[PDB]
Design a protein around this motif. Sequence first.
Motif, PDB file in Angstrom:
ATOM      1  N   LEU D 100      -3.571   1.743  -5.244  1.00  0.00           N
ATOM      2  CA  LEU D 100      -4.500   0.897  -5.970  1.00  0.00           C
ATOM      3  C   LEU D 100      -5.567   1.726  -6.688  1.00  0.00           C
ATOM      4  O   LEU D 100      -6.522   1.169  -7.219  1.00  0.00           O
ATOM      5  N   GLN D 101      -5.407   3.050  -6.705  1.00  0.00           N
ATOM      6  CA  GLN D 101      -6.361   3.938  -7.363  1.00  0.00           C
ATOM      7  C   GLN D 101      -5.579   4.945  -8.219  1.00  0.00           C
ATOM      8  O   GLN D 101      -5.461   6.113  -7.848  1.00  0.00           O
ATOM      9  N   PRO D 102      -5.040   4.484  -9.363  1.00  0.00           N
ATOM     10  CA  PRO D 102      -4.147   5.268 -10.232  1.00  0.00           C
ATOM     11  C   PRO D 102      -4.667   6.647 -10.646  1.00  0.00           C
ATOM     12  O   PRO D 102      -3.874   7.576 -10.809  1.00  0.00           O
ATOM     13  N   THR D 103      -5.980   6.781 -10.809  1.00  0.00           N
ATOM     14  CA  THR D 103      -6.570   8.042 -11.264  1.00  0.00           C
ATOM     15  C   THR D 103      -6.846   9.014 -10.126  1.00  0.00           C
ATOM     16  O   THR D 103      -7.239  10.150 -10.373  1.00  0.00           O
ATOM     17  N   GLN D 104      -6.649   8.574  -8.887  1.00  0.00           N
ATOM     18  CA  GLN D 104      -6.869   9.427  -7.719  1.00  0.00           C
ATOM     19  C   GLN D 104      -5.594   9.684  -6.911  1.00  0.00           C
ATOM     20  O   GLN D 104      -5.429  10.764  -6.344  1.00  0.00           O
ATOM     21  N   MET D 105      -4.719   8.685  -6.838  1.00  0.00           N
ATOM     22  CA  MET D 105      -3.500   8.765  -6.037  1.00  0.00           C
ATOM     23  C   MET D 105      -2.308   8.340  -6.864  1.00  0.00           C
ATOM     24  O   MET D 105      -2.277   7.218  -7.385  1.00  0.00           O
ATOM     25  N   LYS D 106      -1.322   9.224  -6.951  1.00  0.00           N
ATOM     26  CA  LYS D 106      -0.110   8.973  -7.700  1.00  0.00           C
ATOM     27  C   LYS D 106       1.094   9.025  -6.773  1.00  0.00           C
ATOM     28  O   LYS D 106       0.977   9.384  -5.602  1.00  0.00           O
ATOM     29  N   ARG D 107       2.256   8.677  -7.316  1.00  0.00           N
ATOM     30  CA  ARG D 107       3.503   8.668  -6.564  1.00  0.00           C
ATOM     31  C   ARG D 107       3.697   9.980  -5.788  1.00  0.00           C
ATOM     32  O   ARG D 107       3.498  11.077  -6.326  1.00  0.00           O
ATOM     33  N   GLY D 108       4.058   9.849  -4.512  1.00  0.00           N
ATOM     34  CA  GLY D 108       4.281  10.985  -3.625  1.00  0.00           C
ATOM     35  C   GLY D 108       3.076  11.436  -2.822  1.00  0.00           C
ATOM     36  O   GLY D 108       3.228  12.162  -1.840  1.00  0.00           O
ATOM     37  N   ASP D 109       1.876  11.035  -3.234  1.00  0.00           N
ATOM     38  CA  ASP D 109       0.663  11.362  -2.478  1.00  0.00           C
ATOM     39  C   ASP D 109       0.660  10.630  -1.142  1.00  0.00           C
ATOM     40  O   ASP D 109       1.330   9.611  -0.992  1.00  0.00           O
ATOM     41  N   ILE D 110      -0.091  11.163  -0.184  1.00  0.00           N
ATOM     42  CA  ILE D 110      -0.085  10.649   1.185  1.00  0.00           C
ATOM     43  C   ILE D 110      -1.474  10.135   1.572  1.00  0.00           C
ATOM     44  O   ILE D 110      -2.490  10.822   1.367  1.00  0.00           O
ATOM     45  N   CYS D 111      -1.511   8.928   2.140  1.00  0.00           N
ATOM     46  CA  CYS D 111      -2.766   8.306   2.565  1.00  0.00           C
ATOM     47  C   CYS D 111      -2.740   8.059   4.074  1.00  0.00           C
ATOM     48  O   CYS D 111      -1.776   7.510   4.604  1.00  0.00           O
ATOM     49  N   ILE D 112      -3.793   8.499   4.746  1.00  0.00           N
ATOM     50  CA  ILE D 112      -3.997   8.234   6.167  1.00  0.00           C
ATOM     51  C   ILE D 112      -5.157   7.247   6.229  1.00  0.00           C
ATOM     52  O   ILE D 112      -6.271   7.571   5.820  1.00  0.00           O
ATOM     53  N   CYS D 113      -4.918   6.033   6.718  1.00  0.00           N
ATOM     54  CA  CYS D 113      -5.951   4.998   6.567  1.00  0.00           C
ATOM     55  C   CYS D 113      -6.773   4.775   7.825  1.00  0.00           C
ATOM     56  O   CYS D 113      -6.248   4.817   8.924  1.00  0.00           O
ATOM     57  N   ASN D 114      -8.063   4.527   7.648  1.00  0.00           N
ATOM     58  CA  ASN D 114      -8.962   4.300   8.772  1.00  0.00           C
ATOM     59  C   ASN D 114      -9.150   2.823   9.132  1.00  0.00           C
ATOM     60  O   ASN D 114      -9.619   2.515  10.227  1.00  0.00           O
ATOM     61  N   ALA D 115      -8.823   1.934   8.198  1.00  0.00           N
ATOM     62  CA  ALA D 115      -8.981   0.488   8.375  1.00  0.00           C
ATOM     63  C   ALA D 115      -8.104  -0.240   7.371  1.00  0.00           C
ATOM     64  O   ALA D 115      -7.507   0.386   6.496  1.00  0.00           O
ATOM     65  N   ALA D 116      -8.008  -1.558   7.508  1.00  0.00           N
ATOM     66  CA  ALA D 116      -7.155  -2.363   6.625  1.00  0.00           C
ATOM     67  C   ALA D 116      -7.726  -3.737   6.290  1.00  0.00           C
ATOM     68  O   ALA D 116      -8.435  -4.350   7.082  1.00  0.00           O
ATOM     69  N   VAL D 117      -7.444  -4.197   5.070  1.00  0.00           N
ATOM     70  CA  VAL D 117      -7.696  -5.563   4.703  1.00  0.00           C
ATOM     71  C   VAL D 117      -6.577  -6.395   5.336  1.00  0.00           C
ATOM     72  O   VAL D 117      -5.379  -6.095   5.185  1.00  0.00           O
ATOM     73  N   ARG D 118      -6.988  -7.450   6.040  1.00  0.00           N
ATOM     74  CA  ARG D 118      -6.086  -8.368   6.737  1.00  0.00           C
ATOM     75  C   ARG D 118      -5.523  -9.489   5.844  1.00  0.00           C
ATOM     76  O   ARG D 118      -5.871 -10.661   5.990  1.00  0.00           O
ATOM     77  N   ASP D 211       4.646   5.081  -3.179  1.00  0.00           N
ATOM     78  CA  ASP D 211       5.946   4.882  -3.813  1.00  0.00           C
ATOM     79  C   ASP D 211       5.823   4.281  -5.210  1.00  0.00           C
ATOM     80  O   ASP D 211       6.823   4.127  -5.912  1.00  0.00           O
ATOM     81  N   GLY D 212       4.600   3.947  -5.611  1.00  0.00           N
ATOM     82  CA  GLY D 212       4.369   3.242  -6.866  1.00  0.00           C
ATOM     83  C   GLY D 212       2.909   2.894  -7.078  1.00  0.00           C
ATOM     84  O   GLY D 212       2.094   3.052  -6.179  1.00  0.00           O
ATOM     85  N   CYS D 213       2.584   2.454  -8.291  1.00  0.00           N
ATOM     86  CA  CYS D 213       1.238   2.020  -8.652  1.00  0.00           C
ATOM     87  C   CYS D 213       1.370   0.589  -9.159  1.00  0.00           C
ATOM     88  O   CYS D 213       1.661   0.376 -10.331  1.00  0.00           O
ATOM     89  N   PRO D 214       1.184  -0.406  -8.268  1.00  0.00           N
ATOM     90  CA  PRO D 214       1.466  -1.800  -8.643  1.00  0.00           C
ATOM     91  C   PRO D 214       0.664  -2.353  -9.806  1.00  0.00           C
ATOM     92  O   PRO D 214       1.167  -3.217 -10.525  1.00  0.00           O
TER      93      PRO D 214
END
Lengths: 242, 242, 242, 242, 242, 242
Positions: D100-118, D211-214
Amino acid sequence: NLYFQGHMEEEMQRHIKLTPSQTTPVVLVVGDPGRVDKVKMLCDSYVDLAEYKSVECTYKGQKFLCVSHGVGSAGCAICFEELMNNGAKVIIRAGSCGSLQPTQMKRGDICICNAAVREDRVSHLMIYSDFPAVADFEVYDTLNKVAQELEVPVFNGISLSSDLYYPHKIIPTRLEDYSKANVAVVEMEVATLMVMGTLRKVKTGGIFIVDGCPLKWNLVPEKLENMIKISLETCARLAKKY
Amino acid sequence: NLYFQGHMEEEMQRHIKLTPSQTTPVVLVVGDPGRVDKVKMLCDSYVDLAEYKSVECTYKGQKFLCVSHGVGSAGCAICFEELMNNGAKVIIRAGSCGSLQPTQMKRGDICICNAAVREDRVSHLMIYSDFPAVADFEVYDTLNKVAQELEVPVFNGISLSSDLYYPHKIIPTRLEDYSKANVAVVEMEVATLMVMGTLRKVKTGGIFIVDGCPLKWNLVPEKLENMIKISLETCARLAKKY
Amino acid sequence: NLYFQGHMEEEMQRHIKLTPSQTTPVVLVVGDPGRVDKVKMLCDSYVDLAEYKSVECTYKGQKFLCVSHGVGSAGCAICFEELMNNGAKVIIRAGSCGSLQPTQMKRGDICICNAAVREDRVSHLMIYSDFPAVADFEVYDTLNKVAQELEVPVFNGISLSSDLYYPHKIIPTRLEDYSKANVAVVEMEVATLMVMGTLRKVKTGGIFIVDGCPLKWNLVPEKLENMIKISLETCARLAKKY
Amino acid sequence: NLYFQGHMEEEMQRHIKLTPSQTTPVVLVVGDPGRVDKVKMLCDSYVDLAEYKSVECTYKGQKFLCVSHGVGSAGCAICFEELMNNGAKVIIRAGSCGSLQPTQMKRGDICICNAAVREDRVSHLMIYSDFPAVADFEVYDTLNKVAQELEVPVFNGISLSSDLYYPHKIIPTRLEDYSKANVAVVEMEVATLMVMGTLRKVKTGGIFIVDGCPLKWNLVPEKLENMIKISLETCARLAKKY
Amino acid sequence: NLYFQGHMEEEMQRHIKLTPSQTTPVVLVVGDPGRVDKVKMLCDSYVDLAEYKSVECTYKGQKFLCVSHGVGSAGCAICFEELMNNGAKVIIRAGSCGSLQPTQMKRGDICICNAAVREDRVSHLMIYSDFPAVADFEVYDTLNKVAQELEVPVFNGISLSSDLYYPHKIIPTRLEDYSKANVAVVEMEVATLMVMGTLRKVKTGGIFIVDGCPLKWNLVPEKLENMIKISLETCARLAKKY
Amino acid sequence: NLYFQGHMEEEMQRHIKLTPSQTTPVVLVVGDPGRVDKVKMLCDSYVDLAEYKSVECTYKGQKFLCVSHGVGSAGCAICFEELMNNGAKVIIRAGSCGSLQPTQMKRGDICICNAAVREDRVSHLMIYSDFPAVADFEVYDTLNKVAQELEVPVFNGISLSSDLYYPHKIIPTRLEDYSKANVAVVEMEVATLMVMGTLRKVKTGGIFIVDGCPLKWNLVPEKLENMIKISLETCARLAKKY
């Protein structure tokens, strides 16, 4: 002659720290301890009843409390509850409001409200939203009669009781809509008082001085004094009934 | 939905350590903790409500308290006061008495009293001596009706409530005079209960088993059980009314 | 709100066919289905929970199970295991025993045992022979206190739990030796229960009525009823603790 | 030595068909059976534990499960429940996400998340919406530490767990709003895992590969392998703690 | 949520003044209001449901009604009708009878009847005379089983239901003939109940205590109590089925 | 022959004032008393059954009711309830509707609906909003078959049941949205009938004549007569089934 150990003192209410004997039939609630000080100095005499500030006012021969919340709380819902627990019969909220009708009410003008929009949070814990926040007619009428006698001009209308505007400095999203719906002013908790009053058969009312016009984005000393005098004279008159 | 901090628990009475919710409309008061134990074991079931001993009895489907004083006190005047503070509607005192009519009432016989001589100390702190210590007629009538139905023979008459006889093992000076005045029995505090009941609009009564004949200078198990059964059945019947 | 398919019912134990929700903190185990029937009819009310017979008893306001083995099994070791799996906190075994002290205990007398000789087979699968089969002190004490209150005389002593005497009608070879060693009575499986209880931190006890004197080579109805009443009253008292 | 009939096998959980003995303290959950195959072939060795696919992985000397849902189900909420029933202490969800952040994270990048929207459906059946979906800090920290050690660059941020995007190929209406609110990525069920973890005192975390930028309307083999290696190394490290 | 005006209360039956919700599956009918009082005092507890007397009995955990006719009526045919209208499934008539077999049944003996001679008037309005007045076998069997368990001896046989004997103090002309035909006893309305029961698929039975021997031209308290206990225990057992 | 006092008349339903014997298996509900008059005059004969208007129609040899609400009520939800209480098996609502498809359906056209949008208020008191308002297929099919046989052209589609449009002359906010969602027409209460029918296993349907086109901002006599004839013929056909 029958005095039992542990039954010599009255039940004190937890927060306002008052007993029924200390609680008068009529109570004036104001917005902060400083304003209680302003009010008491306009009375004939007063007695300090030392989180929550309470003073017994004497004005025109009648005794009534003047109460506000202190440091550590956001309003006086708990005050209303405990005052009513102690047998208060009439509670009047006096304070500031913001005008939602710029072409009719400006800074320093005084509004005596007959009902309120319930954007106040606390009332919804007591009863469904469809229930009206409405003043006692006798209190409302007496406030108006007193102002007429003092030759102080006032406005009458519905107030918006907001848990956002005064408490958090936040403009409610529906403020403009309510202005268009002929809501006169915005204040904090009169709806809370009105609803609790109806539910508990306690007579309530409200009187407010315009401190600003929020939708256009320091009060006049004489005008503020007038609003306070109306409050005090009204409290005195109602106090005679009990 | 409106729960205020410090207003979540009911007021507990100082000595009996009970709240109104814990207090049943009907209450049986007995003379000591051991007797409370005897009573509760004759009930269908019980719940211990842990100076003053209190148990909630269930008998024939109805809930009522059984209360006595503990170590450190001389009677239950404070119990009566606090039970009535908590909304008790009927209080019956059951216990032992001494017969003042040797040729009519002997050890093990049961007396249901309609009134009492006030030699009890506490009642005189409440009201002038001329005021009668008298049972509620419905309680008195119900106790008699229950005994009739259980086929337990009883006597009816006035009791002498003495602050000397049971509390101090002292023979009152007027004991013989009262015998001649047709006073049936001597017990401890029923006059206290009767007077407080009248003053506070609470229905009272008394039932006593003869443990001795004081003017001639261990109870029968079956006879004591009968007196207790009358008490329990009466409490159950009255409890249905509330 | 989160209910998963296949996770809506509790785990049922294989043999007694009960879930934890069906299992009370206190359980009375008796020797046969007929005796369960005798016990349940002495209760205030009961609910049949239909190899192994289980009923939920209500006595003096408290709920506890009464369980026995049915046709096809020799005892209740599996019952003890599954009851404890389901969270039982107190298990009391009540039944018959043979007196090993003819001059002190005769037919109809009641023994509450504090420990047992492990001639029971099953306990030895759990722990080495040197480990004591011993009752929980609180259970043992409560059974004795209840009997005292009911004015039922009892004996206290060690029991011989035998896999031969009741199960097979065989006289153990050491029976005379144990009599001389001051063993009070002979029964079937209390040692099994005691040991499992200790190992699993579950409180146990035993109460038995003398049905015979085996070393000298139909019970009294009232005496049997007394033993059952002690069991029921004790179960009720312990049930209140949970 | 005490083995009871019908008590020789452990309780198997209904859907994943595993017993506690089969369940390791640490569990890696992935999105499909094919991915389980990819993961197991990167391990030192594995054991297939044959609707729901389960394999015991051995990596760097430590045993942990790798689990996914099979044909016939939409996710692994039931897996989480049953794994926790079987005593799992740490569960990590690894899979794909949309940036959801096209200018910061592109296909193949890895995110380790601390929290989530439910926006996940299942969590709302467990607890009110106001409750946070949040990772265990130790799991989150360990995943980051492992990536640092492997010299794999990652992003950290909040994930949107959506019951629409991956399950139904539907773009959530609030996706753009959440992008503006600094939500990093969109995935499927990590919020479900987080909430259940908190409620059940089980440690959770998540790691996802873009895997993509929706919102702009086949992964890189090496990048996917890196994400898996981080997952495996992290699982190994945590497994040592138990 | 759908409550219609005029549809908030259940249909009350005209004479017994009961609704279906007030009517239990099992009902005990007795002969007069005094006997209802005797029965209810032998129960665990009761609730008075205030021409026709009705009480809800609780006995051994089960709820069932006890009903009789009051002043102004001759029997309970209307009661049977209205009870069945309200969904009663089992109705048992308990009362007095006269022995027609002097050498087999004497005063105080108890008869549980399997069928009745229809000299009752009301049954003939329902169906032709050739139709049998017969008890439900399960009710009959249960009454007998309960008596056996209570160790109360009983007789079994046919009863003569007479509209003359109890209602009018008239000796039926055929009384001697029926005695010779092996009719056991004479009572009032059990045939009415039996026939209505069969016609309406409601299970019925009867139990009677011998109060006299009419052909030879005050009951024993213990014997009457036994008959009532059988009735109550039977009602409790049947009540469990529903 | 058995007639009990107070049991000679059937239960009359509170509002429609009809008994089951007065209620036919099939019922036609129309919108006002005047329309009932129009319908009855098109029948072979009728019987007036004198707030709520009811007539027994005879048409082609079959008896069915025609019912409407009178002065003092807003619709016939209570009618539906009471008709079903009295054993009605089929209820058909016939009346006016507004066309939401101007290019397909114009004034005077007839719509037979298979389902309805629940904007009706009453249905939501019965069941959650997700539950479908749907006609009985046989009723729907029969109405269509009858129209085909009469050579009356009709439309089929979903109706919007609105508590605003006919009752209050208010245009629902979602009216345009529903038009775009292929909703055919707008009427008043068919959704109420459909839902109650499903819940109570009563067969329902609806037929409506277009009286206007609300989104474009007096009926044709022949067209209205056709709609009524379809209703009457359909009611007759269904009535034969019972």
